[PDB]
Amino acid sequence: FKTTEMIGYVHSIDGTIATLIPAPGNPGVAYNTIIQIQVSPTTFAAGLVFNLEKDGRIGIILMDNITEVQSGQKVMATGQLLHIPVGAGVLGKVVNPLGHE
Amino acid sequence: FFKTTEMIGYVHSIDGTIATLIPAPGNPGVAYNTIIQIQVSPTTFAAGLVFNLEKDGRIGIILMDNITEVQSGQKVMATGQLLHIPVGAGVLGKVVNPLGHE
Amino acid sequence: QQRTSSLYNKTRQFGITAALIEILSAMSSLEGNAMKGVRRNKFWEG
Amino acid sequence: YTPPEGLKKLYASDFENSKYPLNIVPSDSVLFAKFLYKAAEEKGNFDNILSDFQKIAAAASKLPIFWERTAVVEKIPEFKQLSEPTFFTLVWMQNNGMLELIQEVAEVYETFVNAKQKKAVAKIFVAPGGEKNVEE
Fold first, then answer.
1. Which of B2, B27, B52, B56 best tests the D interface by mutation, with the highest count of D CBs <10 A?
2. Of the candidates D26, D27, D115, which has its C-beta nearest B26's C-beta?
3. Which of B23, D1, D26, D131 is deepest in the core (most CB within 10 A)?
4. Residue C25 to chain D, least CA–CA distance (Å)
């Protein structure tokens, strides 16, 4: 996933759902898009936007690496919906909903 | 010698068949369970019934007629009286509304 | 007997679920009406 | 932020229960108006707050849409020229994220000032562009 800019930080984590708080200036996140939570300096965790509140807090549905998601971590926006590999190059493989093999 | 009504606030929100009013600062205020008139036009009004008097001053209204004409930000006049309807032998043989309109 | 027992189990489960949902709906309605007032704290002292 | 001593002292006091020209029902937009009125009454000048509200309204017309969501009154230069009470109230609102009540707070403050100064305001409602003739 290609990141564009930071769009806030992780605020609360209730199981598999999370809430973000806006970054300075409220860059904004497109609804129903995929966001990346920087769990580590080199690894990211997928999240799905499902709610854009008036105050600027974004509702996120964590997809993978939930155990490594903590409040205060930076979140980057891809700006696009979820896309997965498709074609004859995926036949015979075992994949997950995010397209990872 | 003027037909001075008693304005008590404005229409804040509309949710279907009920509305919420906001009182203008320094106004007489409406009484509980009384009828109010929402000025949908300089000559037309929509009836309503007071249902809630909240701490914030907002008033819960039950719209009775001309709901489609009600919009947020319209003036509201307080009659200060409960609901009264025509009664007598002259109403027999007629179809009427709960407000008495034939 | 088997049919009535199945109906009994189904009815009790539905009743428990409906009662719990009703109680939670009442609780949510009570919570929603609550409003957070102005905080009287030294905001500058931070 | 370094609020003045007077505003700090008044902030801790229970000014909400003090006497005011009118008995307005408590509300979020009424607390700020009461604080502004109590702060201005000590100095005796009320027109300063009105000028501050005018400046705020003029500045807000140029700020970006939904500026109140990310508004930082400290960083905004237009609010640097406001009086200490108004600036303190704006910072207080920004802390609570209630900058959308500026209009209501200004209205309540104007009502309090008019009541204190014994002024009666007669709203005249006219059609758009029909305000030319108001003799009647």
1. B56
2. D115
3. B23
4. 27
Phi then psi dihedrals of residue A38, to 5 deg: -80, 85
CB A43 within 8 A of CB A1: no
The answer to whether the Cβ–Cβ distance between C43 and D31 falls below 8 Å is no
- The CA distance from D24 to the nearest CA of chain B, in Å, is 7
Nearest beta carbon to residue D108 from set B25, B55, B56: B25
Q: Which two tokens stand for residue C44?
A: 């500058």
* B57/D contact by beta carbon, under 8 A: yes
Nearest residue of chain C to residue D1 (CA atoms) = C44
CA distances from D61 to A9, D55, D64, D67 (A): 30, 10, 8, 10
Transcribe D71-130 into DSSP letters.
--TTT-SGGGGS-HHHHHHHHHHHHHT-GGGHHHHHHHHHHHHHHHHT---------TT-
CB pairs under 8 A between A and D: 12
Note whether B57 contacts D27, CB cutoff 8 Å.
Answer: yes
Helix locations, A31-95, DSSP H: none
- Angstrom CA distances, D85 to A37, B1, D21, D36, stand at 42, 45, 19, 6
D49, D86 contact by CB (below 8 A): yes
Experimental method used, please?
cryo-EM
C contact chains, 3+ CB pairs < 8 A: D
Residue A77 phi/psi, 5° resolution?
A: -105, 135
Radius of gyration of chain A (CA): 14
For D32, the enclosing helix (H) or strand (E) is helix D28-43
Contact A53, A97 (CB under 8 A): no
CA distance B38 to B2: 19
Interchain contact B/D (3 or more Cβ pairs less than 8 Å) = yes
